[PDB]
Coordinates of C-alpha atoms and ligand atoms in Angstrom, one line a residue:
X1 CA 0.0 -0.1 0.1
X2 CA 0.6 4.1 -0.5
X3 CA 1.6 5.1 3.0
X4 CA 3.9 7.9 1.7
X5 CA 2.3 11.1 0.1
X6 CA 2.3 11.8 -3.6
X7 CA -25.9 -29.1 16.0
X8 CA -26.8 -30.6 19.7
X9 CA -23.3 -28.7 20.6
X10 CA -24.3 -25.7 19.5
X11 CA -27.9 -26.1 20.9
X12 CA -26.5 -26.3 24.6
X13 CA -23.8 -24.4 24.4
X14 CA -26.7 -21.0 22.9
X15 CA -29.2 -22.3 26.1
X16 CA -27.6 -18.9 28.5
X17 CA -27.9 -16.7 25.4
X18 CA -31.3 -17.2 24.7
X19 CA -34.6 -15.7 26.0
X20 CA -38.2 -17.5 26.0
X21 CA -40.8 -16.6 24.2
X22 CA -43.3 -15.6 26.6
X23 CA -40.5 -13.7 28.8
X24 CA -40.4 -10.8 26.2
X25 CA -43.3 -8.3 24.4
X26 CA -41.7 -6.1 21.7
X27 CA -43.4 -3.1 20.4
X28 CA -44.1 -2.9 17.1
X29 CA -45.5 0.5 16.9
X30 CA -42.8 2.2 18.4
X31 CA -40.1 2.4 15.9
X32 CA -36.6 3.5 17.7
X33 CA -34.7 3.3 14.5
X34 CA -33.8 2.1 11.0
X35 CA -31.3 -0.3 9.5
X36 CA -30.5 -1.9 6.3
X37 CA -30.5 -5.3 7.7
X38 CA -33.0 -4.4 10.3
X39 CA -35.4 -2.3 12.6
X40 CA -35.4 -1.3 16.3
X41 CA -38.4 -1.2 18.6
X42 CA -39.2 -0.5 21.9
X43 CA -39.3 -3.9 24.4
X44 CA -40.0 -5.2 27.6
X45 CA -38.3 -7.8 28.9
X46 CA -36.9 -1.7 29.2
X47 CA -35.0 -3.0 26.6
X48 CA -34.3 -1.6 22.5
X49 CA -35.1 -5.1 20.2
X50 CA -33.6 -5.3 16.3
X51 CA -35.8 -7.3 14.0
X52 CA -33.5 -9.2 11.2
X53 CA -34.6 -10.9 8.3
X54 CA -31.0 -23.4 7.6
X55 CA -27.4 -22.4 7.3
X56 CA -28.1 -18.9 8.2
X57 CA -29.4 -19.8 11.6
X58 CA -26.0 -21.9 12.6
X59 CA -24.1 -18.2 12.3
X60 CA -27.2 -15.7 13.8
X61 CA -26.4 -18.3 17.6
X62 CA -23.0 -18.4 17.2
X63 CA -22.7 -14.8 17.3
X64 CA -25.1 -14.2 20.0
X65 CA -23.2 -16.9 22.3
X66 CA -19.6 -14.5 21.0
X67 CA -21.5 -10.9 21.8
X68 CA -23.0 -12.3 25.3
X69 CA -19.5 -13.2 26.4
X70 CA -18.7 -9.5 26.0
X71 CA -19.0 -7.7 29.5
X72 CA -17.5 -4.5 29.8
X73 CA -18.9 -0.7 31.2
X74 CA -17.7 0.9 28.2
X75 CA -19.0 -1.5 25.8
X76 CA -22.6 -2.6 24.2
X77 CA -23.4 -6.0 25.9
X78 CA -26.5 -8.2 24.5
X79 CA -29.0 -9.0 27.0
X80 CA -30.2 -11.9 24.9
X81 CA -32.0 -13.5 21.4
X82 CA -35.0 -15.0 20.0
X83 CA -36.4 -17.0 17.6
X84 CA -35.0 -13.2 14.4
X85 CA -34.5 -10.7 17.4
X86 CA -31.1 -9.1 18.9
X87 CA -32.1 -7.3 22.5
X88 CA -30.2 -5.1 23.9
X89 CA -30.3 -2.9 26.8
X90 CA -32.2 0.8 25.8
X91 CA -29.6 3.5 25.4
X92 CA -32.0 6.7 27.3
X93 CA -29.9 9.3 25.3
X94 CA -29.1 7.2 22.2
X95 CA -26.2 7.7 19.4
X96 CA -22.8 9.9 20.9
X97 CA -23.0 12.2 17.6
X98 CA -26.6 13.3 17.9
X99 CA -26.3 13.8 21.1
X100 CA -23.2 16.3 20.7
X101 CA -25.1 17.6 18.5
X102 CA -28.2 18.4 20.2
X103 CA -27.8 22.3 20.6
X104 CA -29.7 22.0 23.9
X105 CA -26.9 20.1 25.7
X106 CA -23.7 22.2 26.8
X107 CA -21.0 19.8 27.2
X108 CA -18.0 21.6 28.6
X109 CA -14.0 20.2 26.8
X110 CA -13.8 17.8 29.9
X111 CA -17.1 16.2 29.2
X112 CA -16.3 15.6 25.4
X113 CA -12.8 14.3 26.3
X114 CA -14.2 12.2 29.4
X115 CA -16.7 10.4 26.1
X116 CA -13.8 10.4 24.1
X117 CA -11.4 8.5 27.6
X118 CA -14.7 6.0 28.0
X119 CA -15.0 4.8 24.2
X120 CA -10.7 4.1 24.5
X121 CA -11.8 2.1 27.3
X122 CA -14.5 0.2 25.7
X123 CA -11.8 -0.3 22.1
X124 CA -9.2 -1.3 24.9
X125 CA -11.7 -4.0 26.1
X126 CA -12.6 -5.5 23.0
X127 CA -9.2 -5.1 21.3
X128 CA -7.7 -7.7 24.3
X129 CA -10.8 -10.2 23.5
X130 CA -8.8 -9.8 19.8
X131 CA -12.0 -8.4 18.4
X132 CA -11.7 -5.2 15.2
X133 CA -14.5 -3.1 14.8
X134 CA -14.3 -1.9 11.2
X135 CA -16.9 1.1 11.9
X136 CA -16.0 2.9 14.8
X137 CA -17.7 6.2 15.1
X138 CA -19.6 8.7 17.1
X139 CA -23.0 7.3 15.1
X140 CA -22.0 4.1 16.3
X141 CA -21.3 5.0 20.4
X142 CA -24.7 5.5 22.5
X143 CA -25.6 6.8 25.9
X144 CA -27.3 5.8 28.6
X145 CA -28.7 7.3 31.7
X146 CA -25.6 7.9 33.7
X147 CA -23.7 9.4 30.1
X148 CA -21.9 6.5 30.0
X149 CA -20.4 5.6 26.5
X150 CA -21.1 2.2 24.9
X151 CA -19.6 1.0 21.8
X152 CA -22.1 -0.2 20.0
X153 CA -22.7 -1.3 16.3
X154 CA -21.1 -5.3 16.3
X155 CA -21.7 -8.8 15.9
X156 CA -25.5 -8.9 15.8
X157 CA -26.2 -5.0 15.8
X158 CA -24.0 -4.3 13.2
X159 CA -25.6 -2.3 10.6
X160 CA -25.8 0.8 8.7
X161 CA -27.6 3.4 11.1
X162 CA -26.9 6.6 8.8
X163 CA -26.7 5.5 5.3
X164 CA -25.0 9.4 4.3
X165 CA -21.9 8.1 5.6
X166 CA -21.2 4.9 3.4
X167 CA -19.7 5.0 0.0
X168 CA -20.1 2.1 -2.4
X169 CA -16.6 0.6 -4.0
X170 CA -17.3 0.5 -7.4
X171 CA -15.3 -3.0 -7.6
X172 CA -17.1 -4.8 -4.9
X173 CA -20.1 -3.2 -4.3
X174 CA -19.2 -3.1 -0.4
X175 CA -20.3 0.0 1.3
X176 CA -17.5 2.0 3.5
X177 CA -17.2 4.1 5.9
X178 CA -14.5 5.9 3.8
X179 CA -14.2 9.0 5.7
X180 CA -13.3 7.6 9.1
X181 CA -11.4 4.1 7.7
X182 CA -7.4 3.8 7.5
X183 CA -4.5 4.7 5.0
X184 CA -4.1 1.2 4.3
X185 CA -7.9 -0.1 4.8
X186 CA -9.1 2.3 1.5
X187 CA -6.6 0.7 -0.3
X188 CA -6.9 -3.1 0.7
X189 CA -10.4 -3.5 2.4
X190 CA -8.8 -5.0 5.6
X191 CA -9.5 -4.0 9.2
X192 CA -7.1 -4.5 12.1
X193 CA -7.7 -3.3 15.4
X194 CA -4.4 -0.1 14.1
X195 CA -7.5 0.3 11.4
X196 CA -9.6 0.9 14.6
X197 CA -7.2 3.3 16.3
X198 CA -7.0 5.5 13.3
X199 CA -11.1 5.8 13.3
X200 CA -11.1 6.5 17.1
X201 CA -8.7 9.2 16.0
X202 CA -11.5 10.6 13.9
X203 CA -13.7 9.9 16.4
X204 CA -11.9 12.1 18.9
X205 CA -12.6 15.1 16.3
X206 CA -16.4 14.1 15.7
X207 CA -16.3 14.7 19.8
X208 CA -14.1 18.2 20.1
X209 CA -16.6 19.3 17.2
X210 CA -19.3 18.0 18.6
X211 CA -20.5 15.7 16.0
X212 CA -19.4 17.7 12.6
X213 CA -19.2 16.0 9.6
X214 CA -14.8 14.8 8.4
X215 CA -13.4 16.1 5.8
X216 CA -17.0 17.8 3.7
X217 CA -17.4 17.3 0.4
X218 CA -14.6 14.6 0.0
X219 CA -17.2 11.7 0.3
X220 CA -15.5 9.1 -1.9
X221 CA -12.3 6.9 -1.8
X222 CA -11.2 9.8 -3.5
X223 CA -10.2 10.4 -0.1
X224 CA -7.4 8.4 -0.6
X225 CA -5.9 11.2 -2.9
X226 CA -6.9 13.8 -0.5
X227 CA -5.1 12.0 2.2
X228 CA -1.6 11.4 0.0
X229 CA -1.3 14.9 -0.7
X230 CA -0.2 14.5 2.8
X231 CA -3.7 16.0 4.7
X232 CA -5.1 15.6 7.9
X233 CA -8.4 16.8 10.1
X234 CA -7.4 20.3 11.4
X235 CA -7.3 21.0 15.1
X236 CA -10.8 22.0 16.4
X237 CA -11.5 25.4 17.8
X238 CA -12.2 23.6 21.4
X239 CA -9.3 21.0 21.1
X240 CA -6.1 20.7 23.4
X241 CA -3.3 21.0 21.7
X242 CA -2.0 17.8 23.7
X243 CA -5.4 15.9 22.7
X244 CA -4.9 16.7 18.6
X245 CA -1.2 15.1 19.0
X246 CA -2.9 12.1 20.1
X247 CA -5.5 12.7 16.7
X248 CA -2.1 12.5 14.7
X249 CA -0.3 10.1 16.5
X250 CA -3.8 8.2 15.5
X251 CA -3.3 9.0 12.1
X252 CA 0.7 7.7 11.6
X253 CA 1.2 6.3 8.0
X254 CA 2.6 3.1 9.7
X255 CA 0.0 1.4 11.2
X256 CA 2.6 -0.3 13.6
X257 CA 3.5 3.0 14.5
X258 CA 0.0 3.7 16.2
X259 CA -0.7 3.8 19.8
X260 CA -2.4 0.9 21.2
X261 CA -5.9 1.5 22.9
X262 CA -4.0 0.8 26.3
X263 CA -1.7 4.0 25.5
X264 CA -4.3 6.1 24.2
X265 CA -6.5 5.4 27.4
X266 CA -3.7 6.2 29.7
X267 CA -2.7 9.7 27.6
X268 CA -6.5 10.8 27.6
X269 CA -7.0 10.4 31.3
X270 CA -4.1 12.2 31.3
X271 CA -5.4 14.9 29.7
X272 CA -8.7 14.9 31.1
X273 CA -7.5 14.6 34.6
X274 CA -6.3 18.4 34.0
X275 CA -9.5 20.3 32.9
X276 CA -12.2 21.5 35.6
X277 CA -15.4 21.7 33.6
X278 CA -15.2 25.3 32.8
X279 CA -14.7 25.9 28.9
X280 CA -17.9 25.4 27.1
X281 CA -17.9 24.0 23.8
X282 CA -20.0 25.4 20.8
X283 CA -20.6 24.5 17.4
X284 CA -18.3 25.9 14.6
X285 CA -21.0 28.4 12.3
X286 CA -19.5 26.7 8.9
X287 CA -20.5 23.2 10.2
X288 CA -24.0 24.5 11.0
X289 CA -26.0 21.9 8.9
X290 CA -23.6 20.1 6.9
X291 CA -23.6 17.0 5.9
Ligands
84P301 C1 -28.1 7.2 14.1 N1 -28.1 5.8 14.9 C2 -27.3 5.1 15.6 C3 -28.3 3.7 16.1 C4 -27.1 3.2 17.0 C5 -26.1 2.9 16.7 C6 -25.4 1.9 17.2 C7 -26.3 0.6 17.7 N2 -25.6 -0.7 18.1 N3 -27.3 -0.9 18.4 N4 -27.7 0.1 18.1 C8 -29.7 -0.8 18.2 C9 -30.0 0.0 19.3 C10 -29.4 -0.6 20.7 C11 -29.8 0.0 21.7 C12 -30.5 1.5 21.5 N5 -31.2 2.3 23.0 C13 -31.8 3.5 21.8 N6 -32.5 4.3 22.4 C14 -32.7 5.5 21.7 O1 -32.8 5.8 20.1 C15 -32.8 7.1 22.3 C16 -32.7 8.2 22.2 C17 -34.3 7.4 22.5 C18 -31.6 3.0 20.9 N7 -31.0 1.6 20.1 N8 -30.6 1.2 19.3 C19 -27.7 0.8 17.7 C20 -28.0 1.7 17.0 C21 -29.5 4.3 15.6 N9 -29.3 5.4 15.5
CL302 CL1 -13.6 22.0 31.0

C-alpha cells in the first residue's frame, strides 16, 4: 500500500443466551430507529429489540454466544436473542453524535474528552478479545441514563444506521465508512485494531467539533488521494493541543506506529484530569447544517 504522500453442541452452548418467547414483549408501534439489516423497536423484557430477516441460523446462534461473552461498562452488552430478534439494553440518550450535536446540550471540554476516554476503554477491552470493530464512529457509540458511553454497532447489532456516511466501492460493491478508514484499509479493504485506532482518532475529532462531518465534500474513495497529498483533519477550535497530538498519532501513516488502545486510555486520562469543567464547547458556524 501507498503510505508516503505523493447441531446439539451449539444448542446447549447457546442456552445461556436465549430468551423465552413468553418472557419478552416487543412494541412494534414505536420505531426507535431503522437500519439496512433490521428495524429497531421498543421492548419489555425495558430494552431495544432489533428484528433481522437454515445455514444462516447457525451463524445467528454462534454470533450470540460470542457477543454474550463481552461484558464491559463501555461496551453495549447483549441481553439475549429470540426466534430473529436481538435484545439490547435501551440507551436513553441515543447515539453519541446526535447527543453532542444537540444544541440544547451544553458539553464542556472535560465532558467531551471524558466521552472519548470512555470509548477508548471500550476499545481497549474489545481489542484485548482480538475483536476488530471495522466501523468505529460517534454514530455507532451510545449513551445511557448516567452518560456512560457504550461502544455499539457490532455482532448481531451490526448495521448502517446513517446511510449518508457509507460509500460504495465500485468493484466489490461494499458500502464502507470511508471518512473513518485508515489509509491502508482504503486501499486493501482489510481492517485491524490499528485501523480501529485511526477511526478512533476521527471519533475524537467528531467529539471536539460536536459532531461535524469529517472532510466536507470529500465523500468517495478519492479521500485516499486527498490524504496522500499530505493532509489530516484540522485541529478543532476547542481541542487542546495535547489531544490533537494524540489524534495525529492515531493517523500515523505506518499502522504499527499508532498507539494501542491501552496507551490511548493512559494518555487521554492524563489530559482529561487537567480540565475542571469551565470550558464550554460551542458549535462552529461553518459546520452547522453540513452533511
Ligand atoms: C443514528 N443511529 C445510530 C444508531 C445505533 C448505533 C449503534 C447501535 N448498536 N445497537 N443499536 C441498536 C440500538 C441499541 C440500543 C438502543 N437504544 C436506543 N435508544 C434511543 O434511540 C433513544 C434516543 C431515544 C436505540 N438503540 N438502538 C444501535 C443503533 C441508531 N441510529
Ligand atoms: Cl472544561
